[model samples]
Target: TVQLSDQSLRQLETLAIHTAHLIQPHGLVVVLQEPDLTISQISANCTGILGRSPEDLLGRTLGEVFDSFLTAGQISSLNPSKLWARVMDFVIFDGVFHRNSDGLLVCELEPAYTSDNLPFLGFYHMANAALNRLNLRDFYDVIVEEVRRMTGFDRVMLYRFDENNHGDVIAEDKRDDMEPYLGLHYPESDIPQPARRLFIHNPIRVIPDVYGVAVPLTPAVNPSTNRAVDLTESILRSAYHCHLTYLKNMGVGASLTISLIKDGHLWGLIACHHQTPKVIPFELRKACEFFGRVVFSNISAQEDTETFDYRVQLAEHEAVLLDKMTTAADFVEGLTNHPDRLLGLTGSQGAAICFGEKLILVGETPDEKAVQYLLQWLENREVQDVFFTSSLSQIYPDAVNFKSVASGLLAIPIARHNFLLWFRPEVLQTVNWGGDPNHAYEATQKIELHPRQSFDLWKEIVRLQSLPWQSVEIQSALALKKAIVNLILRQAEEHHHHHH
Candidate 1:
């Protein structure tokens, strides 16, 4: 018994020609690798079957040339072996054929299916294996690894944006050929603020092939001529134009982007890049897009859980600390015993208590200027809740050599006209990387973290860093809100007791 390659089968041409005579129809003969599911060779019969030249089908993937007849599951189930299989009568949809068939065209087709399942499983299993092997506490790292493995890109990273719209690279999955970019910080001017706002509207943005023209969906019924010419949507055309400009600036030839949203806000983007020109098949792109959504949901859930747990723990502990405080002096004394409780509740690196416009208690002062700026901002705003620039350079124009150790501040008006100020140091600093000062430079390469410096960069960075709600930040903010409410209730009870 001998095997006939789809290419070697001169008989296939004769069979197609003969079959047309016998059945009064055109026939298609396609050969595919079983386990790997790649098209090994295709026959010239495609002209009659697909209204396409043999040259068109030779190097192209089946799905690229033909509207895919097989589902992803069926495609994955194909094995990589030399096997000849036939279906007695497979009715393919008329839409798949390019010929203008009058009503319905049914073609009897012969294709190959292999028994080897390893390749299909290998493609998916590798990602699962990498995820399991890696000890990633953050969903950001997990997604980076998944993207790198799936796309074979040199580097994948999680970039995040700060309140001031600066981008920073918080995590990375790097290959040997890639340069190290973890922990670098880019300037805010790199991604202007206005661009960041645009990201919130466009959830999924992609550049399939940098060199290719963007194809627009054909209007079902042309508004102008009542004839379809496949005119692209205006938004898509605009986005494509913007993407080309961005790619030219970045020196990248290909990219795929998906936006991460939180609280109806454009949180970040999951940006996939290739230095070389590349086009991913639509199926693979869909898989990546689907996974991006899944990962974002998971991250959001995880963040929410961590946040709630932290707040609950803080509330429990703080309640005990507040019980020990009988007087203003006791309140000041209790700060020393429970510094962590206070910081945890406020979601800050440090906290301070001020009574009657004067600082009376403080805990874990990472930077004095941050504390003063927070108090000043609160006073100026005359609001119970306020935020200030933790960076001295941002607050004071004359300040020199003032590297931003702390990033931002949160102020909560507590009971009896006392205020609680929380200082959140730049995430890099809180992680103990701020001392070197050069660490900020290293973060810029990461798309997720680099956006904190500017709105545009922040929009791009957030897309990459977009994870399911960690809830820690939100919970921390909400916990501070809850703590304030509790303090107000306690003060009201005391005032009522004194009046009686």
Candidate 2:
């Protein structure tokens, strides 16, 4: 029964998650000064982990606290490594050393516990074989199944985001007892832009416990710079309270999400979920991260090939249509003679060729009166060459009258008085929301920022929309518009020559 209580979805965008200045209590972070490894700042939970209070270790050098630390002269000189430190006792921690956005050197450490070793060599062969013997058929299944099997997560989902930032769970592999999340649509607010950006910056996000305490930085602000330590790239940085609450409501005890990046943009995610608290060792996590990168490249390669094929097909259609128009005496006759070619050029259900008082209609279309009025309406507006929309009724109120027949409109003006137009009928779609507790009752409730309690199947019928027009289709129409202009000019020049 949970509903969106917030009036504005933009509220989540304002939070600066990068400067949260907190780390998960499971790990400890030490912000060090350059040149020498003097501990400038440390997490408050240092006493519990290393048996040393923040005050005790604040000004001490790395050499003073540990019998043997990293042998590097400066932190910046060394890449992220597994550091074994001795504080009266030997402790091996998975260590990551990097500079924050403020250029301050930071050391993040999580206690490295021995876990069952995953055979890296074996996985390498499996993935290698799968990629070599494959085309672009159901690659999503391979990644989802691989992640779930390797990590032992209860469920794994491959989520691909669309143009509007909302995403669908395209492929899912889950335990029999767990409800399937495949084909469900989640709102963009569920994973706001800020969170999506973080996925690009840091590819792998692991939340071992949804209810873990967030250990705040001792000084809160960096004592040297008088600013919060930017934990943007810190692996042990604490998760946001809002995010943790959302995970809790979903009955998720742990989660590990890997980013599938394409062309420096967050394309999709390989999301793994556990019903109970779980921890993935550093080695295994690194292995999974590497696998994600490998799989994503193959995905991008296949997508490019598919896109290239479609462009070639459109170009062929454009070439034929252009030839037909130039051979005929009248351009309108050429276009009207082959209705299928005219409609196929833009993949439209209906087309209109308007020149002077002649209006030729093709295929399924709005009535003559409705279309004539629509053309009159377009004349008043500033449409240079081409205009298109999937939902025309949103901007043009009168379009609602024929929304069923012409919900989507694409137009190319031949001149101020003549034009070419295409129409697409409305397509009804079923949008299933993930978190709706009540399916039978349709009650209006203000949706607070809380995550929904129940992920019951809730379907909403969506209308007044049509299939989107691709950029290639629009470009095809523009090419035709330019050709028409040139042909009319040549004919007018011939008429003048005869008169002279």
Window of ten residues with lowest summed lDDT in model 2: 437-446
lDDT of 1 at 230: 20
TM-score of 1: 0.50
After aligning candidate 1 to the native by TM-score, how far in Å is the CA of 395 from where it should be?
A: 4.9
Runs in model 1 deviating more than 4 A are 1-119, 132-134, 137-142, 152-155, 173-175, 186-204, 213-242, 261-265, 326-389, 392-500
| Tens digits of lDDT, candidate 1, 213-312 | 4322212222333432221110122232433654654556666666667677655566677777664433454466566666777777876787677767
For model 1, state the Cα shift of residue 49 in Å: 18
Which regions of candidate 2 are displaced past 4 Å?
1-7, 67-80, 86-90, 120-125, 135-137, 437-448, 488-500
Candidate 2 C-alpha lDDT tens digits along 1-500: 33233334545766678889888888888988857789988888878868778767888966567543323545554444556655556776767787766777788877778634456565455655665565544678878877777788999999989888888898898999999999888877678888898988888888888788898888889888988878777788887877887788778889998889889888999998888989877667777778867887888999989888887777777778789989987888888998888888888899899998899999888999889988988898968757899999998999999998899999888877788999999999778877552331122444345555566667878799989999888988887888888888888887885434
- In angstroms, how far off is 240's CA in candidate 1? 4.4
Model 1 worst lDDT run, 10 consecutive residues: 96-105
| Residue 483 in candidate 1, Cα distance off native in Å | 7.2
